[PDB]
Design a protein around this ligand. Structure first.
Ligand SMILES: O=C(O)COc1c(C(=O)O)sc(-c2cccc(NC3CCCCC3)c2)c1Br
Length: 297
């Protein structure tokens, strides 16, 4: 039971060993396609690659490779696509993936520049009057509107398949204050953001899997997905005790390596789930409380 385990591990200050045990037991599968010579410039980090069995394949004959993984949580019945921050040459691929996979939401947990480096390409239009055209994948992207909060921004985008002229609305949830290798300011600010993704309908099973990214697509992205999945499992059975967080994280790691980068991110996952459990089990005041405590205004 998480809350008891959390107090136990915090009392004995052994989050490092607990987290390290996860790394020791994590699945290991081949990433041969990602390591092919021709795909070197399609990877942001040499040591972060998608496993071949769960990698997202672009629908093209030339080169179907993108650094992205389909995290399919069978029991929870929710899927996520975790990918890297798009590179200057893979933004077309990124949106091609969004289109072909029928995703409605894109969750971005990093800033373009962090600690003096470029963690992610500017893959979306910043101004209405300057849409973006991706010639290689033949797609057009237009900023329709944006709602800027104190620590996150929600943008409404229009993605067009130039080949068929079909258009789709994509919601972009940009979390802008989550430090790399760090944790959110509080469970409240994190949950307020998650509940805003959730309330947009972006996670509905009627849409394709939501796309989640940071820089490498495993640390902050891993924390976000673990918390969401655990809350959903808890929700489906209306029983917080039935959720084994570490077991869920190990399950997720069968689809993409490295999920959750630090022991404190793991510890934060517990905090978020435990707090979120209040809403799941029918507390109608916490959502407004989180909103208040997050100071999004
Ligand atoms: O999102 C965050 O909090 C931090 O994000 C990041 C990075 C960043 O934002 O710069 S780099 C990085 C990384 C790059 C190469 C190898 C490994 N580490 C290996 C550890 C063993 C398993 C395979 C990955 C981790 C991670 Br994650």
């Amino acid at each position: 039971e998480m809350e008891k385990e959390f107090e136990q591990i915090d009392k004995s200050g052994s989050w490092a060993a607990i987290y390290q045990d996860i790394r020791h037991e994590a699945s290991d599968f081949p990433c041969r396609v990602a390591k092919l010579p021709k795909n070197k410039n399609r990877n942001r980090y040499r040591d972060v690659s998608p496993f071949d069995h769960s990698r997202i394949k672009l629908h093209q004959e030339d080169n179907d490779y993108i650094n992205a993984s389909l995290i399919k949580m069978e029991e929870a019945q929710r899927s996520y696509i975790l990918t890297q921050g798009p590179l200057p040459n893979t933004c077309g691929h990124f949106w091609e993936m969004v289109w072909e996979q029928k995703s409605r939401g894109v969750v971005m947990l990093n800033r373009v520049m962090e600690k003096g480096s470029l963690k992610c390409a500017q893959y979306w239009p910043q101004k209405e009057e300057k849409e973006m055209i991706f010639e290689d994948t033949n797609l057009k992207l237009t900023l329709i509107s944006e709602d800027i909060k104190s620590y996150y921004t929600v943008r409404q985008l229009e993605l067009e398949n130039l080949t068929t002229q079909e258009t789709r609305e994509i919601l972009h949830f940009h979390y802008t204050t989550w430090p790399d290798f760090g944790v959110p300011e509080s469970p409240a600010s994190f949950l307020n953001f998650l509940f805003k993704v959730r309330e947009s309908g972006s996670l509905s099973p009627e849409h394709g899997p939501v796309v989640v990214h940071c820089s490498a697509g495993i640390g902050r992205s891993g924390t976000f997905c673990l918390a969401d999945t655990c809350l959903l499992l808890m929700d489906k059975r209306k029983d917080p005790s039935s959720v084994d967080i570490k077991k869920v994280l190990l399950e997720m790691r069968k689809f993409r390596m490295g999920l959750i980068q630090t022991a404190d991110q793991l510890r934060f996952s517990y905090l978020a789930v435990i707090e979120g459990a209040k809403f799941i089990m029918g507390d109608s005041s916490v959502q407004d409380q989180w909103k208040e405590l997050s100071h999004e205004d």
